[PDB]
Amino acid sequence: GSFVEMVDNLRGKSGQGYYVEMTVGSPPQTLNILVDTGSSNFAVGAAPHPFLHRYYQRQLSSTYRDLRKGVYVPYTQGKWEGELGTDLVSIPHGPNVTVRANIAAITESDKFFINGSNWEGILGLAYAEIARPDDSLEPFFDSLVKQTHVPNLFSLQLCGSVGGSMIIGGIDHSLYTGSLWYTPIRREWYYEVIIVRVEINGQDLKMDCKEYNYDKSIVDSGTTNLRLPKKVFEAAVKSIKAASSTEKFPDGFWLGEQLVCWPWNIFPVISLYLMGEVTNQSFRITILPQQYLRPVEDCYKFAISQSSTGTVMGAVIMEGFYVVFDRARKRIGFAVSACHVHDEFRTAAVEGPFVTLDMEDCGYN
């Protein structure tokens, strides 16, 4: 219930994500590693890419073991490829343990490392099913739990130069107010959840709830935006446009093609009702414009965007909440974050219970 050593173990820069300090190899090589609940590989820079402060030097490690197997990982914005091995991995501001884990040594990439960022690898915290090349490659957290007495959960407080906490193996009650409310992990691949209802300023979108989860809904710390399926986004922007019609803005702003510069109260709250733990029971999470209007260094980007890969509950959602990935119990907890950005009139909320029928119909098959 209290893990003072792991509080404030996350750093970052606005729009560049949250990283934790890790050590790989013997003797230990310190690296900054992006915390990513949306993927399942531990993959680290291993060559002198000019964007990198530092990189894994396998030759300096007595505990390195070659798996003699490559991995090629394309995605929409470029790619990464590497050489698979294992080594001793530890987290200085995490539990006092050392695990042998899979490491993908990154040897070629495109649009992967960010120019000007301060991280040099990615910690994929999701499940084996989506690991590359396949589900036989054991994710870091699976190895951590198998090899130690660290309980099978972690929690994230993303605050938003940004900070936060990754509490590994537990919950720190000082990081949130009120109660945690839990939604079932629908399937152990991504952190998949089911959205059963959507409100803008209390006004229901009145869509078949299957649309909210077309073709999935996930909790992803490795994504900035709240991403909504095309049809849902269309309807969401329509209602946000109406609620905020005091001032007019160009079409492009709502498409994230332009910025807007200067006002919070003109903008509506967004509420996602999540499937609860009990038959016919749900709960609601509520975010402010402070979450979905991203400061760009007074200009702001509209951080709700359309998607073809489902709902992505990225930093826009997570910065309002303390988020518990309760792997042991196949559930994700949300509670109001003790660090979220708010004004004197509105705060992010987690509320329940609500009565919602046919919640199982909301999941896509």
Ligand SMILES: CC#C[C@]1(c2cc(NC(=O)c3ccc(C#N)cn3)ccc2F)N=C(N)OCC12CC(F)(F)C2
């Ligand atoms: C390994 C891996 C992976 C990725 C990935 C994520 C990122 N993410 C970021 O750079 C980022 C920036 C700002 C925030 C905030 N707040 C969070 N994350 C970069 C490269 C990736 F490659 N991880 C996530 N969650 O989604 C995108 C992918 C690329 C993919 F293959 F489609 C998966």
